[PDB]
C-alpha cells in the first residue's frame, strides 16, 4: 500500500443535482449525489478532466483548491466558467511533482488534502451552494505515500457536520489496528477546533512525522476556518484500545449543540467495550 | 542546559475537585488546596500516572486529558460512564509512549508536548459549565533530552478572562534577565484569540525553539488559538531587549481593551524594573 | 533578482504620522506622503534601524513593532511612557540579530520574518482607534541568502476591509507570468479571516517556500489568520496555471460577499490577460 508515481490522464463525469429539502449535491452518476460529494484522488503528475453537467434549474460551478488549473477552469462567474442550467463543461485539473526550478528554488508539489465546491449558487462566492451541500474532498498523493485501509471525510459546514441534523454524527466504524485516514474540511461562516478522543496526529502534510527529525507539532486539537483543509492517518485504538472514541468541535456551544460524532473502534470480535 | 531524562516511572497522585469562592471550581493535589488553573502535571515520555480522583462537590464531575494515552474507561465522559458522582472516587490512568518505528515502516509519534486536562461533565456533557467554573489544568510531557526551564507559567484564555481573573488583573509573572522561562498557553470556551508577547518570540513547533539551523518552523510573536488549543515554548527572559514590564495580551482589539492583558515583569539582576510602578 | 546580504549596518529613516482624508491616519517616510498600509521597511538580520518619528497630528500617537528587538523605551506604549505627544518627536530604535548557538547549547532564533508595526495609543491604550484609522505597515527582516523578489505587495485584512479600502475595490496587483511575487499578509482588528489565493499556493513556513525535499512544512492555498498575525510568501506568477485574473479573497463567506476581494492580474509577455472582462 504505497502510492505510485502519477502521470495518467484520467476522466470523470460529475453532476450537480438537487437533493431533498433544498439541499444540492455532487455525484459521479445522476441520482447519486452525496453530501459531501465523491472523493477524488490522484497521484502527483496526474491530469483529471471532469466532464461536468448541471442538472439543476439554477447556475452552478466547480472550483478546486490546491490543484493546477488555468483560468478557463476557474469555475467562477467572474471568469465566465460557471455552468448554465442543463449545461455541460469540461473542467481540467492538473498536478505536478515537486522539483528544483531553473532559478534554483524548490517548487512545492501538488500533494495534499484539498477540496472542491460551488462558486456561483446564491452569491458569486458560492455561499448558497456551499450551504446547500456542494462540497467534496480531493486527495493528491505523493509517490511512496502510505495508503490507508479507509478514508472518511468530515466537513464542518457552519454548525453542522456534513449538513446532518444536530446530534446525528456521522459515525465511522473501524477495527483496532486499522490504518484510518481522515479528511477534514471547514466551510461557511465560523471558526472551529476539531478534536479527537484517544488519538493524535502531526500538523503537517500527511499527519505523520517523517521520522525522528520532523519538528512538526503533534496535536489532537486543530483550529480551522472556512475553506481550510487538512488530513491525517492514525492507527485505530493505537495505545488506547477499543471503544466509542468521540470526535467533535471543541468550541463549547458547538459540541453542546451537536457537532459531535463517534469513531467506533471494534475489538477483533466486533464488540465495542462500554458502548 | 539541564535536560529531561528518559521516562518509564509509574506514578500515583491524589486529586480532588473542590468548590471555590465565587461559584468557581478547581482541581488540586491536596484537600483545601485546589487552584485555577489546576496543578501543573509533569511527566517524562513513557511515564504512567494513576490519578486517585475524589469529587467533593454536589454535582458529578470528571477528568479528561488531551494528547496522552488512556483507555476508554479513563475517557472521563458521562458517555462512556467515566464521570464521578458527588462524593465519589475513581482512579484515572494516563500513559505515555516514546516515538518509534512501526512494522509498516511509518514513524509513530510520541506523547511529548504541551497538553491539558479539564472537566467533561459539569453543566453539559462537554464540561462547558465546569470549564467556565475553572476546572482546567496543564500537562507537560517531556521527551528525553528536552531542555528544562528555570520556571513554568500557565496562561489560560478562558472565554474573555485570563485564568478566570477579573479584567486588568494580570496575572503578572516575574523573572530576571537571562532566566529560561517556559510558558504553557491554553485556550478554552467559545471565542478565538491571538496570544501576543511584547519583546519576545518563539518557534511555532513542539518545544517553541528551533532544533538547529535546518529547522524551518516559523518564528512568531502572535499565535491564533481556539478552544482547547494548547501550545508552549521557552524564552530567555529579556534576551536582546533588556529588563522592563513586558505586556502579554490577546491581540483581538476589544479583548485587550476590555482586560485580557498581563505583565511579564523582567527584572535586572538587582531586582528592579526600569520605568515601572509596582 | 539576487539574494539578501548579511546585515549589520546602522540605519536612519524619518517617519511621520499624518491625518488623511476621511478621518484616516497614516504613516509615511516623507511629509505629505503618508499611505495605508504604511511604507514597507526592509532590514537584513543584524541591521539596526533608528526611526526619527514625528507626530504631526493633534492627538497622541505611537509606533510599536512586532518581531524585532527593542528596548523597553521603544515599546511604543503609553503604559511605558513611549508614545509621542501632539507635535512631538521621538527616536524609536529597532535592532535585529542573526540566529546562532547559545552558550548553554541551545539555538537562538534569528529576527528574520514577515513582521509589522502599528499604533498603540490612538483611541485606546491598545491603539484600537489608530489601527482602525490605518496606522499599520509591513516590516521584512531577511536572512542572509534569502531569495529577493521582483515585487512586494502588502495585503492587510483590517476588520472587514482590505487596506482600509471600500468593499469590492481591490486592491488589484499586476504581474507578468514568471515574475517572482512576494506577498506580505497582515490581519488587524476584531475578526478572524481565512486568506485564499486562486491559482497559487505556498508553504506555511517563514519564507513561504519549501527549503527543499526534506522540508515537511504544509503546502496550502488558504490560511486562517487573526488580529496582528503576519505571514508572507513568494510565488511564481501564473506558475503552472498561466495568465488570468486570479482572485484573492477572504474565504469566510459573508466577508467575500461583502467586500474582501481583490485581483492578482497576471499578464502574458504581450501584456494581455485572457478573458479578463470587468
Ligand atoms: Cu465549531
Ligand atoms: Cu474555495
Ligand atoms: Cu481574545
Ligand atoms: Cu478537551
Ligand atoms: Cu474575513
Ligand atoms: Cu501589535
Ligand atoms: O473560493
Author numbering:
A (entry chain C): 41 to 315
B (entry chain B), C (entry chain A): 40 to 317
What text does the study give?
Laccases (benzenediol:oxygen oxidoreductases) are copper-containing enzymes that catalyze the oxidation of diverse compounds by molecular oxygen. The active center of laccases contains four copper ions: A blue (Cu1) mononuclear copper center (T1) and a trinuclear copper cluster (T2/T3); the latter consists of the mononuclear T2 copper ion (Cu2) and two T3 copper ions (Cu3α and Cu3β). T1 acts as a center for the reception of electrons from the reducing substrate, while the TNC serves as a binding site for the molecular oxygen and its reduction to water.
We considered that the replacement of the His165 (“gateway” of the proposed tunnel) to alanine could fix the tunnel in an open state, and the hydrophobic phenylalanine should close the tunnel. In the case of substitutions for phenylalanine (H165F and I170F), the tunnels were closed. His165Phelow Cu was obtained from an overproducer strain cultivated with 0.25 mM CuSO4. The structures of SgfSL, and its mutant forms with sufficient occupancy of copper ions, were obtained via the cultivation of the corresponding over-producer, the E. coli strain, in a medium with a high concentration of copper(II) sulfate (1 mM); in the case of cultivation with 0.25 mM CuSO4, the laccase crystal structures were deprived of copper. In line with our hypothesis, His165Phe variant showed drastically reduced turnover rates for ABTS; its catalytic efficiency decreased by a factor of 255 compared to SgfSL wt. This would explain why saturation of TNC with copper ions could only be reached at the increased (1 mM) copper content in the growth medium. Thus the Phe at the position 165 may hinder the access of both dioxygen and Cu ions to the TNC via the T3β tunnel.
